């Protein structure tokens, strides 16, 4: 039976007189660092000598190297890329982590790989948000939050749970719900979303766009319908609330609803389900983890090549033409991470 | 090259001293009515004797039967289901449409089928928003808009275009962009999104949930990752702004990016391409239109059954379980259609 913590199940008492070192000031680090400060938690940033160090200083944080941040903290949040956990743990964290100190990862990968490990006298946990940085930050400022999963891997102090959930509460996850889930399950689940679901959603949008273009439809209009209008985006985000079939029922004309229900449950052949299983086997079997380590140890040059190639795909050429000629509703993001 | 109107390309001058009859107070009707009212346009609602009639009165609109609203209007927006257009046009609109009056549809279907036709002495246009009612209304109140396609079908007065684009500005569509597109192409494009893409997107989310649960993953966690968390919804909506591959490049960890690009462009078999082609054929050759008419004739009895059947699929059973347990952040839609500035 699932164990889910909300605001009534956590407090900031565990953080009284304690310092949190946010290690890394990237997509997660910046949001955690911002939300912790605004919740009145004493917070530090530990970062290498790169652009994120300068950004942290620009947004008013105490910033040092990782070793000094860890040395001066009761709670350490390791929010750097997963392939870099091993070296930073062995060289910078493990040697400097105080007795009774808590170390938290935001993803189970490094724990499954044995790159981050329990240490005598210290607490090890996962607090893994189900959302990226900007949304977590905007939700927090509007008195809301996104969900998280947590796992208490090692608890020498016996106070690991209260401290992990106090961190979750300070960053806002308890406003949605923080659910117990093993670090190993979170790893395979998270990598599945990234490797099957997300690529497949975009491939499907792209297939809609490519067929419409081949069949002589206006490319701007084809792009707009398949996601560019924001309509498929809204259906999916409104669907998160009330349900996907329920969005079509509430919001679709009878013409739309009859069309939708003619093909609902019939569009995908069994080969899609079978690829999903192949992707899961690769994640669980160690094949992905090996591929990731290869792709990593060049400062991700093969990823740079892929990101640049993607921007010249027809869909993305058409996106730039539509966005130049159609204004999309956005919200000002300036000072979003400065003190509330 | 495309014809795309924004705010600097339209004005409210063509609506000075003119009345708009909104026919229907549904998803589109309620949104048009509110945005028109708030933009300082005199508006009336024409509606049959159902709950939408009472809703329009409760939200403070002048409501009558369709015939009276049309008879007292310079511009008429036909915002009822597409299969009801034929009988309402013949009985309520055509005999009461003033000389020099404009009739607009928000979808090209009734025009393709010939159920709404040009009338001597009058203007006929399509103004088809690329968005449903709630977002249209929320965007408007934020000083933003949804995109729309327009087509001038008949222009007796010579003022059809100015008036269509005037309505578009009043409702907020020109804050995004209003593009000239033929009613026939809008019909097939709009139906294709509804009949191929939207089902495929939900079928794919469903496949994700099903494979995870059948391999013994926590059902609540599986539901959350495939859409329930809002993350995949946020990726698609943010992607509308900056691009889908760009969202993953800006917001995804290096782990996420390496995984995404390992399978991006390799997930779908050719069968999904061929299905989209099959759906376009059914739409273009009149097979869907025949199907919709058989469906409409039953008072949408089959639609009621499928809607109730869908609530019992494991995905939607897991949805209610997740939503009872996790709080999802949403704005109060309660005041959304109340009078504004
Ligand atoms: N991307 C997301 O929104 C989410 C991230 N996570 C997890 O959170 C953690 C942080 O991920 P992101 O914020 O996306 O990462 P990111 O790509 O934004 O990481 C940037 C930060 O990592 C530091 N960094 C990078 N390589 C380093 C190295 N070799 N040594 C030291 N510091 C280094 C940079 O200085 C910078 O502060 C990861 O474990 C990730 O799996 C999980 C949930 C959501
Ligand atoms: N659903 C959407 O978000 C969008 C709809 N459209 C188009 O807008 C038009 C309106 O569709 P929705 O607002 O979604 O429909 P809806 O299902 O919300 O329509 C409800 C309204 O239609 C009236 N109505 C229903 N049957 C009627 C009949 N037989 N005679 C007279 N009035 C009747 C009701 O009294 C009520 O006012 C359609 O042509 C549709 O294709 C296009 C763009 C977006
Ligand atoms: C409910 C969403 C997915 C579709 C709404 C839409 O854009 C239409 O043309 C219609 O419902 O007829
Ligand atoms: C950017 C979206 C699709 C994913 C963000 C997320 O949930 C992760 O675990 C990650 O980036 O590593
Ligand atoms: Mg994730
Ligand atoms: Mg439609
Ligand atoms: Mg549509
Ligand atoms: Mg991840
Ligand atoms: Na429903």
Q: How far apart are CA B131 and CA B123, in angstroms?
A: 25
Give the Cβ contact number of residue A9 at 10 Å.
14
> A213, A314 in Cβ contact below 8 A?
yes
CB B221 less than 6 A from any atom of ligand 4:
no
Greatest CA separation for chain B: 68
> A82, A31 in Cβ contact below 8 A?
no
Which CA distances in Å does A308 have to A250, A293, A296, A303, A312? 40, 21, 17, 9, 7
Q: What angle do CA B186, B190, B192 make, to 5 degrees?
A: 120
Q: How far apart are CA B88 and CA B94, in angstroms?
A: 9
Q: Which of A305, A79, A201 is nearest to B201 (CA)?
A: A201
Q: Whose CA is nearest to atom 18 of ligand 1?
A: A26
Pair of tokens at residue B25: 């107070």
Instruction: Kindly state whether A317 is in contact with chain B, defined as any CB-CB distance less than 8 angstroms.
Output: no
Phi, psi for residue B124 in degrees, rounded to 5: -130, 130
DSSP state of A98: P
Q: How far apart are CA B230 and CA B326, in angstroms?
A: 12
Which of B2, B144, B231 minimises the CB distance to A220? B2
- Scored b (16 or more CB within 10 A) or e, B315-332 reads bbebbeebbeebebbeee
Sign of CA dihedral A215, A222, A315, A131: negative
Subunit contact A198:B260, Cβ cutoff 8 A: yes
Instruction: Assign 3-class secondary structure to B183-239.
Output: HHHHHHHHHHHHHHHHHHHHHHHHHHHHHHHHCCCCHHHHHHHHHHCCHHHHHHHHH
Distance A131 CA to ligand 1 centre (A): 14
The contacts found for B301-306 with CB under 8 angstroms, 24 or more apart, are B302/A258, B302/A261, B303/A254, B303/A257, B303/A258, B303/A261, B306/A261, B306/A264
Phi, psi for residue B150 in degrees, rounded to 5: -130, 155
Q: How far apart are CA B80 and CA B24, in angstroms?
A: 5
> A44, A21 in Cβ contact below 8 A?
yes
Tell me the Ramachandran region of residue A294: left when phi exceeds 0, alpha when psi lies from -120 to 50, beta otherwise: alpha
Three-state DSSP class for residue B178 = strand
Subunit contact B227:A206, Cβ cutoff 8 A: no
> B190, B288 in Cβ contact below 8 A?
no
Q: How far apart are CA A99 and CA A73, in angstroms?
A: 11
For residue B125, with 0-12 CB atoms within 10 Å meaning exposed, 13-18 middle and 19 or more buried, which class applies? buried
Report chain A residues whose CB lies below 8 A from the CB of B222.
189
Report chain A residues whose CB lies below 8 A from the CB of B297.
none
Three-state DSSP class for residue A278 = helix
For residue B121, the distance in angstroms to the closest alpha carbon of chain A comes to 30
Phi, psi for residue A320 in degrees, rounded to 5: -65, -40
The contacts of residue B57 (CB under 8 Å, 6+ apart) are: B63
Pairing status of strand B178-180 against strand B148-154? parallel
For residue B126, the distance in angstroms to the closest alpha carbon of chain A comes to 15
Instruction: Determine the length of chain A.
Output: 340
Q: Which of B233, B165, B235, B145 is nearest to A326 (CA)?
A: B145
Distance B125 CA to ligand 3 centre (A): 19
Our measurement of the distance from residue B38's CA atom to the centroid of its chain's CA atoms, rounded to an integer in Å, reads 20
The contacts of residue B285 (CB under 8 Å, 6+ apart) are: none
Which CA distances in Å does A137 have to A25, A46, A53, A333, B142? 13, 20, 19, 10, 20
The contacts of residue A75 (CB under 8 Å, 6+ apart) are: A15, A18, A19, A20, A21, A101, A102, A104, A163, A167
Phi, psi for residue B110 in degrees, rounded to 5: -60, -30
Q: How far apart are CA B35 and CA A11, in angstroms?
A: 44
Pair of tokens at residue B261: 């690009």
> A32, A9 in Cβ contact below 8 A?
no
For residue A192, the distance in angstroms to the closest alpha carbon of chain B comes to 9
Pairing status of strand B178-180 against strand A148-154? unpaired
Pairing status of strand B42-46 against strand A178-180? unpaired
Q: How far apart are CA A22 and CA A105, in angstroms?
A: 11
Subunit contact A311:B245, Cβ cutoff 8 A: yes
Residue that has been written with the tokens 């000083």 in this structure? B143
Which CA distances in Å does B126 have to A8, B36, B79, B107, B201? 53, 17, 11, 7, 28
Report chain B residues whose CB lies below 8 A from the CB of A256.
194
Q: B 164-223 residues with CB below 8 A of A?
A: 175-177, 179, 181, 185-186, 188-208, 210-212, 215, 217-218, 220-222
The contacts of residue B214 (CB under 8 Å, 6+ apart) are: none
Residue that has been written with the tokens 């406003």 in this structure? A175
- Scored b (16 or more CB within 10 A) or e, B11-22 reads eeebbeeebbbb
Q: How far apart are CA A246 and CA B33, in angstroms?
A: 24
Q: How far apart are CA A32 and CA A15, in angstroms?
A: 14
Q: Which of B201, B146, B256 is nearest to A128 (CA)?
A: B256
DSSP state of B333: G
- Positions of E strands within chain B: 4-5, 19-23, 42-46, 63-64, 75-78, 102-105, 123-129, 148-154, 178-180
Distance A191 CA to ligand 8 centre (A): 6
Q: Whose CA is nearest to atom 4 of ligand 1?
A: A132
**Helices (runs of H) and strands (runs of E) counted in chain B:** 17, 9
Q: How far apart are CA A41 and CA B326, in angstroms?
A: 25
- Scored b (16 or more CB within 10 A) or e, B63-94 reads bbebebbbbebbbbbbbbbbbbbeebbeebbe
Q: How far apart are CA B128 and CA B20, in angstroms?
A: 17
A206 marked among binding-site residues:
no
Distance A258 CA to ligand 3 centre (A): 11
For residue B174, with 0-12 CB atoms within 10 Å meaning exposed, 13-18 middle and 19 or more buried, which class applies? buried
Subunit contact B203:A268, Cβ cutoff 8 A: yes
Most B-contacting residue of A178, A233, A302 (CB-CB within 10 A), to test interface: A233
Any residues with Cβ below 6 Å from ligand 1, and which? A 24-29, 47-48, 50, 52, 79-82, 84, 88, 106-107, 128-129, 132-133; B 251-256
> B78, B102 in Cβ contact below 8 A?
no
Pair of tokens at residue B247: 């969202």
For residue A180, with 0-12 CB atoms within 10 Å meaning exposed, 13-18 middle and 19 or more buried, which class applies? middle
For residue B185, the distance in angstroms to the closest alpha carbon of chain A comes to 7
What number does the ligand 1 atom closest to the CA of A52 have? Answer: 37
- List, edge to edge, every strand of the sheet that includes A19-23: A4-5, A178-180, A148-154, A123-129, A102-105, A75-78, A19-23, A42-46, A63-64
Residue that has been written with the tokens 């509804």 in this structure? B194
Q: Whose CA is nearest to atom 9 of ligand 2?
A: B79
Q: How far apart are CA A127 and CA A107, in angstroms?
A: 7
Subunit contact A207:B273, Cβ cutoff 8 A: yes
> A249, B245 in Cβ contact below 8 A?
no
Pair of tokens at residue B55: 């809703």
- Positions of E strands within chain A: 4-5, 19-23, 42-46, 63-64, 75-78, 102-105, 123-129, 148-154, 178-180
Tell me the β-bridge partners of B44.
B21
Which of A134, A233, A264 minimises the CB distance to B199? A264
- List, edge to edge, every strand of the sheet that includes B123-129: B4-5, B178-180, B148-154, B123-129, B102-105, B75-78, B19-23, B42-46, B63-64
Residue that has been written with the tokens 């290869």 in this structure? A294
The contacts found for A220-223 with CB under 8 angstroms, 24 or more apart, are A220/A318, A220/A321, A220/A322, A220/A325, A220/A326, A220/B2, A220/B179, A221/B149, A221/B179, A221/B181, A221/B185, A221/B186, A221/B189, A222/A318, A222/B189, A223/A315, A223/A318, A223/A319, A223/A321, A223/A322
Pair of tokens at residue B81: 């289901």
Three-state DSSP class for residue A75 = strand
Our measurement of the distance from residue B338's CA atom to the centroid of its chain's CA atoms, rounded to an integer in Å, reads 21
For residue A27, the distance in angstroms to the closest alpha carbon of chain B comes to 6
A50 marked among binding-site residues:
yes
For residue B59, with 0-12 CB atoms within 10 Å meaning exposed, 13-18 middle and 19 or more buried, which class applies? middle
Pair of tokens at residue B256: 């996420």
Greatest CA separation for chain A: 68
> A191, A283 in Cβ contact below 8 A?
yes
Instruction: Kindly state whether A107 is in contact with chain B, defined as any CB-CB distance less than 8 angstroms.
Output: yes
Which of A233, A260, A329 minimises the CB distance to B236? A233
A–B interface: beta-carbon pairs under 8 A: 448
Which stretches within A229-328 are classed as H helix?
231-242, 244-251, 254-263, 270-285, 287-296, 301-310, 314-325
* Known catalytic membership, residue B107: yes
Tell me the β-bridge partners of B66.
none
Subunit contact A313:B245, Cβ cutoff 8 A: yes
Pair of tokens at residue A218: 């206006």
Q: How far apart are CA B130 and CA B190, in angstroms?
A: 8
H/E stretch holding B277: helix B270-284
Distance A239 CA to ligand 9 centre (A): 11
Q: How far apart are CA B238 and CA A230, in angstroms?
A: 8
- Which ligand lies nearest the alpha carbon of B202? 3
The contacts of residue B84 (CB under 8 Å, 6+ apart) are: none
> B168, B146 in Cβ contact below 8 A?
no
């Amino acid at each position: 039976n699932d164990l889910i913590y909300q605001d009534e199940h956590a407090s900031l008492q565990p953080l009284e007189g304690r310092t949190v070192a946010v290690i890394g000031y990237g997509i997660q680090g910046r949001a955690f660092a911002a939300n912790l400060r605004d919740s009145g938690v004493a917070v530090r940033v530990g970062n290498i000598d790169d652009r994120y160090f300068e950004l942290a200083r620009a947004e008013g944080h105490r910033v040092t190297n990782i070793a000094e941040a860890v040395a001066h903290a009761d709670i350490v949040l390791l929010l750097i890329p997963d392939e870099a956990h091993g070296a930073v743990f062995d060289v910078d964290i493990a040697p400097n982590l105080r007795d009774g100190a808590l170390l938290c990862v935001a993803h189970g990968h490094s724990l499954v790989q044995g790159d981050v490990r329990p240490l005598p006298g210290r607490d090890l946990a996962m607090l893994a948000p189900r959302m990226y940085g900007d949304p977590i930050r905007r939700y927090y400022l509007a008195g809301q939050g996104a969900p998280a999963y947590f796992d208490i891997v090692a608890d020498h102090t016996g106070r690991a749970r209260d401290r992990v959930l106090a961190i979750a509460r300070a960053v806002g996850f308890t406003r949605a719900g923080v659910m117990a889930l093993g670090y190993r399950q979170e790893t395979f689940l998270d990598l599945f979303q990234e490797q099957f679901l997300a690529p497949a959603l975009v491939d499907l949008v792209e297939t809609g766009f490519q067929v419409l273009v081949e069949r002589g439809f206006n490319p701007k209009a084809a792009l707009l319908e398949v996601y560019g209008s924001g309509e498929m985006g809204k259906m999916m985000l409104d669907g998160a609330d009330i349900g996907l079939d329920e969005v079509v029922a509430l919001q679709g004309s009878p013409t739309c609803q009859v069309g939708y229900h003619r093909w609902r449950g019939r569009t995908l052949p069994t080969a899609v389900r079978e690829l999903a299983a192949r992707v899961l086997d690769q994640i669980e079997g160690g094949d992905f983890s090996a591929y990731l380590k290869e792709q990593a140890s060049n400062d991700y040059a093969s990823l740079d090549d892929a990101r640049r190639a993607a921007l010249k795909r027809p869909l993305n050429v058409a996106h730039a033409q539509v966005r130049a000629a159609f204004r999309f509703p956005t919200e000002a993001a300036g000072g979003l991470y400065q003190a509330a």
